[PDB]
From a paper:
Diphtheria toxin (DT) is secreted by Corynebacterium and causes disease in humans by inhibiting protein synthesis. DT consists of three domains—receptor (R-), translocation (T-), and catalytic (C-)—and similar to many other A-B toxins it enters the cell via the endosomal pathway. After the binding of the R-domain to the EGFR-like receptor on the cell surface, the toxin is endocytosed into the cell, and acidification inside the endosome promotes the requisite conformational change and membrane insertion of the T-domain followed by the translocation of the C-domain into the cytosol. Following translocation, the C-domain is proteolyzed from the R and T domains and proceeds to inhibit the EF2 translation factor, leading to the termination of protein synthesis and cell death.
DT was crystallized under varying buffer conditions in an effort to determine if conformational changes, particularly in the T-domain, are observed with a decreasing pH. Since the crystallization conditions were identical except for the buffer, the crystals of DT-5.0, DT-5.5, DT-6.0, and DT-7.0 have similar unit cell dimensions and diffraction resolutions. Overall, all of the structures are very similar, with RMSD deviations between the Cα atoms of 0.34 Å (997 residues, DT-5.5), 0.38 Å (999 residues, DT-6.0), and 0.41 Å (1000 residues, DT-7.0). One region that stands out is the TH2-TH3 region of the T-domain, which consistently displays large B-factors in each subunit of all structures. Interestingly, the residues between H223 to P234, which span TH2, appear to become more flexible at a lower pH. Analysis of the B-factors for each structure shows ordered TH2 residues in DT-7.0 and slightly higher B-factors in this region for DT-6.0 in each subunit (TH2-A and TH2-B). As such, these structures suggest that the structural stability of TH2 is pH-dependent. The set of the structures generated for mildly acidic pH values of 6, 5.5, and 5 retain essentially the same conformations, with the hotspots of partial unfolding highlighted by the elevated B-factors. We demonstrate that neither catalytic nor receptor-binding domains change their structure upon this acidification, while the T-domain undergoes a conformational change that results in the unfolding of TH2–3 helices.
Numbering used by the authors:
A (entry chain A): 4 to 39, 48 to 187, 200 to 352, 354 to 516, 522 to 536
B (entry chain B): 5 to 38, 48 to 187, 200 to 351, 354 to 516, 522 to 537
The structure:
């Protein structure tokens, strides 16, 4: 019951990876030893890029140096025992172990290695590494881990790069879409741009026109938006001017709101220390405006445009420190650039990692105040290759006032996929509402509720979509245009569009 | 597939059937039919049955018929099913995969194997998500045995609109919006008339271009009208209760009235069902209804009448500026909006989990957070050992931070397992540094920056350790929620996931 046989195997020269903190990259290669409770043991993973994320200075985890990644290998045969649950008690009861001795102590006995090892010399436990990941984590008994041989995958400190660039440049190989930026180039171009802009003519003439004394947030954002406009005319920011001109997330006013907000929270104690600056910056809103990240996309994905945005942000913080600050320099050009760069790398890394987009599987689709999601993963799958019925639950609510649900657009395929008009319905806080379904064309049925549906704070709906298949012939991608069910919200003549994405699969 | 805990035998088994206008008296002569689920449908909940009683040709606005109670004499087996897929049911319960399920249900061999001696079988299924009622599926021929008596005839109450049905449905709650819609209709007609002759308002209709204009100007005139109309003393209470919350501001009544006049043409204003279908798809109705932040604020007949009267006048004023017709404002507009009021009020009277409870999302400041599963939202007690709990987190557009999480602790009983507690961002696992704030609250910060946004989500895994098999008593626990902290504005955006303490089962 608790062992997943599909994830269990025996293997010769079983290898795994271990992230190593600075100062241990070379010592750990002399053998795994325990330092001077069911889960006490040596930890590793099958994904060396996830290993790399355990490698940062423990005293300065936000900003410190990354150590390395090493590869550990068991001689001979090793049993990888994948467990379906991470509760040790549940595991010891259901495997007939002694519920007293720790779980990882027993994993290392000869008696356990016989009952579960399949002839191998040792057992390693395997568990899901994390939600949203396909990696595994391996738990090794410490005594058994003395057999491991340890060699080097990478030493980030040996690369001799600034900040955490080496670690994140390594992690970006995972997707070698992919944001793979040369952060040496970006730093150098950033330094050059701040210098060449502080020594401009109208920028000089716009720093001349500055209150240069603690005024209210209002005059500050006004002057800062002015500065922004003036600074954006320089030819070293001309591409930035172009990619930030339409999307309102990238407007002067958000740069100004960013720079004001930075100056409010950065005092001298903080500005004096990189780790403290990064923590402070890392809890601010609006970092999307300077990163160029909006609508599910990293728009600023070239070294040149990123350097421009960071330089422009560097200037505006410099200008915002006297107007709404207790601080008295400099920070804008050094620790603020270091720190923001680190936050860039963090978010870029997130966007490079495989992830389900809004409205896919059980990820919510957030739009116009609505929140909609497939109730479970299986609901988002339209199974094919049988005659008969399926049902699919979509959750719907909204953030505050009552917003309508006008209906739902559903996919159909002549002969293979039909809306079951009798089982399809929508339920609002348990009130069950029937639907009037009408084909738009041969591929789309529109279903509208027979009484008004509203959702809002405290009011939710479950839309239950029922499909009927009149043939057992499978569906091929030729036949389906849409890959989404369109839930329609309020009308503005257009309807707000809430999309739930499905995949067609066999059993 | 049979849930034996919901299955029983009963003498004089009774249930309710919603009945559409025209058949209230006809149906009491006996249940007669006019594929796997062909059959007669009833429910254990007579207020849910009432929702089936509306004219099938004007389901939005039509007249409501009634509810009857049907009773089987002798013994009835209620067979509750764990699935509503007939194929799966016919396979697991060894039946002809050929014959319809509800035909087999009414055969003597079915009644032998499953009836427990009872004369006939009724199938029971969950009525709906978010509901605790059941639907009963009766074999048609077996249903001929039913005696049928009248629970209520909404048409006999002689009331306007769907008032009688919704007034019936409000009994389920005896917190309960139970409004007298007769009174609200009377007070509403009275105020529209009594505002139409006012001095300043008559003179604020004087200054109306009474000719098509730009929407941007239309809203300026109507916000003007709104301010002037709100000084009338028949609206004095409305002025007080709408003065602070920006959902209830004049600009929002103006947007409502403008959007109304845009979609009502002559064909539409002359037919109540078509008015209601058109009004029902507009945004902003919460401004008129006084509904915001999870609460029905306008919950008195007087204040609802005031709000509906004012909206009516403003619609009246917005049709010449932005519209195409005559009268609508005081006739079909009022009837239709009243029905939309009753729909939403009924939703708020029904039992429902609030945001952040069970798997209902908590939507705040652009974030969306929820418990992954119902069981995650329960902290079990009465044992020594561990539990884990998953919270989903994302945000609507740009990257927003997650600063940390506030967790409950109990000196000696409930502690944060700092090794297993972590947060994972698109699969990147991030350890946490946890530090007690007092004896009752721990604060865990992620050791790398966490951001969520469109396409970037997080799973917060909270693990709890109990060093005592003694149960937690409501006393020991101050909060009923886990506090996830977002961005700093000096305060953090507060995202609340509410839990319940329960013993093992």
């Amino acid at each position: 019951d608790v062992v997943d046989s599909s994830k269990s195997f025996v293997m010769e020269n079983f290898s795994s990876y271990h992230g190593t903190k600075p100062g241990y990259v070379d010592s750990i290669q002399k053998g795994i030893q325990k330092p001077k409770d069911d889960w006490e043991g040596f930890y590793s993973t099958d994904n060396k890029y996830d290993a790399a994320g355990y490698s940062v200075d423990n005293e300065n985890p936000l900003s410190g140096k990354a150590g390395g990644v090493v590869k550990v290998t068991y001689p001979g045969l090793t049993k990888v025992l994948a467990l379906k649950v991470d509760n040790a008690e549940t595991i010891k009861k259901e495997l007939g172990l002694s519920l007293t001795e720790p779980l990882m102590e027993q994993v290392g006995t000869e008696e356990f290695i016989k009952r579960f090892g399949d002839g191998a010399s040792r057992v390693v436990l395997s568990l899901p590494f994390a939600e949203g990941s396909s990696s595994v984590k391996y738990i090794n008994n410490w005594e058994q881990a003395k057999a491991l041989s340890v060699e080097l995958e990478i030493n980030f400190e040996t690369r001799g790069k600034r900040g955490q660039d080496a670690m994140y440049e390594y992690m970006a190989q995972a997707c070698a879409s992919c944001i793979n930026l040369d952060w040496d180039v970006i730093r150098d171009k950033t330094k050059t741009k701040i210098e060449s802009l502080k020594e401009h003519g109208p920028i000089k003439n716009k720093m001349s026109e500055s209150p240069n004394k603690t005024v209210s947030e209002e005059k500050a954002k006004q002057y800062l938006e002015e500065f922004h406009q003036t600074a954006l005319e320089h030819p070293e920011l001309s591409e930035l001017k172009t990619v930030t001109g339409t999307n309102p997330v990238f407007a002067g006013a958000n740069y100004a709101a960013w720079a004001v907000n930075v100056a409010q929270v950065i005092d001298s104690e903080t500005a004096d220390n990189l780790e403290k600056t990064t923590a402070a910056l890392s809890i601010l809103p609006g970092i999307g405006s300077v990163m160029g990240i909006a609508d599910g996309a990293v728009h600023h994905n070239t070294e040149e445009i990123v350097a421009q945005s960071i330089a422009l942000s560097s200037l505006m913080v410099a200008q915002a420190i006297p107007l709404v600050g207790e601080l008295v320099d400099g920070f804008a050009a050094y620790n603020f650039v270091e720190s923001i760069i680190n936050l860039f790398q963090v978010v870029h890394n997130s966007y490079n990692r495989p992830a389900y987009s809004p409205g896919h599987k059980t990820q919510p689709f957030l739009h116009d105040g609505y929140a909609v999601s497939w109730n479970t993963v299986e609901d988002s799958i339209i199974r094919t290759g049988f005659q008969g019925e399926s049902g699919h639950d979509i959750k719907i609510t909204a953030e505050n006032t009552p917003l309508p649900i006008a209906g739902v657009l559903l996919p159909t395929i002549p002969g293979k996929l039909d809306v079951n008009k009798s089982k399809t319905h929508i339920s609002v806080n348990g009130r069950k509402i029937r639907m009037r379904c009408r084909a738009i064309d041969g591929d789309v049925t529109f279903c509208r509720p027979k009484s008004p549906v509203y959702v809002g704070n405290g009011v939710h709906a479950n839309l239950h979509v029922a499909f009927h298949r009149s043939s057992s012939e499978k569906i091929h991608s030729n036949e389906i245009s849409s890959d989404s069910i369109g839930v329609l919200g309020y009308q503005k003549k257009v309807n707000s569009k809430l999309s739930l994405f499905f995949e067609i699969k066999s059993m």
